[PDB]
């Protein structure tokens, strides 16, 4: 069961989103990270496989705007990693892995 409860302000600053997997701290990770994870699952896997991602913003978001995007990632990490495809990817679960040693 994968949750984002919280992010934090880290450094130039920038949003992280603290990835939990049964409500126990796994990851670290900015949005960028995120966003580069889906570019590569979708030039594997081909598209229309993958949950749209929450989109780039223009302007340096709002408390309101980061919570959204909060809840959104929480939504498309949790999709993904319930696919069977999706989910079970090298690609995704590498990510995951250097993400958590490098957290801890």
Do not use: W
Not at 2 to 7: D, K, L, M
Not at 43 to 71: C, D, H, I, M, W
């Amino acid at each position: 069961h994968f949750s984002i409860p919280e992010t934090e302000s880290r450094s130039s600053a920038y949003v992280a989103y603290n990835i939990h997997v049964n409500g126990v701290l796994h990851c670290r990770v900015r949005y960028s990270q995120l966003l580069g994870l889906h570019e590569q699952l979708r030039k594997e896997y081909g598209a229309n496989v993958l949950p749209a991602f929450p989109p780039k913003k223009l302007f340096s978001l709002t408390p309101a705007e980061v919570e959204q995007r909060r809840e959104q990632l929480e939504k498309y990490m949790q999709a993904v990693r319930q696919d069977p495809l999706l989910g079970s990817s090298e690609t995704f679960n590498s990510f995951l892995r250097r993400a958590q040693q490098e957290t801890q």
